[PDB]
Nucleic acid binder design. Structure first.
Lengths: 150, 55, 51, 117
RNA sequence: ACUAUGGUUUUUAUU
RNA sequence: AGGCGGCCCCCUGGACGAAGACUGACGCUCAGGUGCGAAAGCGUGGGGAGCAAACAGGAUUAGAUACCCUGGUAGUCCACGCCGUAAACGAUGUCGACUUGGAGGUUGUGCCCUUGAGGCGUGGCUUCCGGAGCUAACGCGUUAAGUCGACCGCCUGGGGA
């Protein structure tokens, strides 16, 4: 209730020209295994090599334009009642949410291997259907069933 | 003080809805206010002033 | 008692709290308010407007 | 079948529901929508948005009668008495008059008391 | 701020 | 005092002032008794939209004979008769004297070209401090819980009751 902090500023990679590689290697990272992270980083662009489009330098960051986060749901309690609100995503954190939603299927699906799960889910990217899409699609229901908040 | 045959003098103590205005506003004070209320309530029942309002 | 206005303003303009109308006091105070009890509340509190 | 330009709406908003009826000033109804009939339940059935979608469903009426000029007669305390007008006045119609027509006992016969929980 | 709601916790030792 | 706020027409109770005057203790209180009753209930007929004790149906829940939703009988309205009850509230018996100061509300009367809802005397009602006094303490304080003069009720540790 009184500790006040901020955010750490990060630089674009000298090879990849993007700020995505500066943060995305810390996402899906576990047990301090950052060399495993540097070994699965965009490794689905080989399982998607026939569906990658022009320039593999941007061929993963273009997917965030189809991950397209719009709202995040917060749930808190006032008195006895727990309530839920869909709020619009914030000007820098909108990119962090896209970076979180893009790895929802990376283990929690039957396809085997991270790269194949991710390439299959990056090919469901336009419609967003079936498994691993709950946190992406069902958050939007709350913002289309209600447009009168304070 | 009591008569209904002039409404041009009574209009000052009422609203557009025909409601009687309280004496603290009009400088009438309670005694003369209670007289003007009788002239208005007579003019009401003779359909010379509005009684009820809906619009 | 009811308010009169040629058109409702696009905002509620609330200076005072617990005020009815215009999306306020929703399914509340459904008990009896009483004829003399409002004066008993004016005996029991005399500076309620400035808390 | 013929365009007559003119109509009058009757809106009622409560703490449970909202009703929107479109009429001619000859008293004649031409279409109606409700916030319950919008598919809403409970503490949500009265909401400004459940009423907003009922107004969008009602704003599809009277197209062949060619109505554009609108008066609105409003009732009830519910939050639905505002979003309904805003949305209808955006759906091709133009407001000319808004008046509150809530029917009131002034004053009798014994004060209401209900639901203690 | 107000969840739609629940009844009941053996006894005894600073004199 | 219970109580009185749709309006009308008839009828009628008690209260207030100036100055002048008449009568003259005609003034006060009071066991028993009398008259007066909000609501509920009851005698009896009529009414009965609505509100709703009984209760049914539904729902809630451990249960739900209650709180919640839909009804619904008595009762609530009238005339007339009973029942005298209370957190009866300005809690403090009835009537009356006495005491320092201020400000406000209301309304008479007498006075001021009122040539001012305003003033200066002066009564009735009323509202808030507050001096003296009282009170564990809050609080009363000229409409006293103070100080005196008359009359009459009520009280005597909790529980059982």
């Amino acid at each position: 209730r009184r500790r006040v902090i901020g955010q750490r500023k990060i630089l674009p990679d000298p090879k990849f020209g993007s700020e995505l590689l500066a943060k995305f290697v810390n996402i899906l990272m576990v047990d301090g295994k950052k060399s495993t992270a540097e070994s699965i980083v965009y490794s689905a662009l080989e399982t998607l090599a026939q569906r990658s489009g022009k320039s593999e330098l941007e061929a993963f960051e273009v997917a965030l334009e189809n991950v397209r986060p719009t709202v995040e749901v917060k749930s808190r309690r006032v008195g006895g009642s727990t309530y839920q609100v869909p709020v619009e995503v914030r000007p820098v954190r909108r990119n962090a949410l896209a970076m979180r939603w893009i790895v929802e299927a990376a283990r929690k699906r039957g396809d085997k291997s991270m790269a194949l799960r991710l390439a299959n889910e990056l090919s469901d990217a336009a419609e967003n259907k079936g498994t691993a899409v709950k946190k992406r699609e069902d958050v939007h229901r709350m913002a289309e069933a209600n447009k009168a908040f304070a | 003080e009591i008569d209904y045959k002039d409404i041009a003098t009574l209009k000052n103590y009422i609203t557009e809805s025909g409601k009687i205005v309280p004496s603290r506003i009009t400088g009438t004070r309670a005694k003369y206010q209670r007289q003007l209320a009788r002239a208005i309530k007579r003019a009401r029942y003779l359909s010379l002033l509005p009684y009820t309002d809906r619009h | 008692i009811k308010v009169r206005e040629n058109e409702p303003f696009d905002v509620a303009l609330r200076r005072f709290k617990r005020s009815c109308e215009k999306a306020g006091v929703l399914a509340e105070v459904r008990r009896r308010e009483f004829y003399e009890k409002p004066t008993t509340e004016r005996k029991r509190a005399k500076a309620s407007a400035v808390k | 079948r013929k365009q007559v330009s003119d109509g009058v709406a009757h809106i009622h908003a409560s703490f449970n529901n909202t009703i929107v009826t479109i009429t001619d000033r000859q008293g004649n109804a031409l279409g109606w929508a409700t916030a319950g009939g919008s598919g809403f339940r409970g503490s949500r059935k009265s909401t400004p948005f459940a009423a907003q979608v009922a107004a969008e469903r009602c704003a599809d009426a009277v197209k062949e009668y060619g109505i554009k000029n609108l008066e609105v007669m409003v009732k009830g305390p519910g939050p639905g008495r505002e979003s309904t007008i805003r949305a209808l006045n955006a759906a091709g119609f133009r407001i000319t008059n808004i008046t509150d027509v809530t029917p009131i006992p002034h004053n009798g016969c014994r004060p209401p008391k209900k639901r203690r929980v």
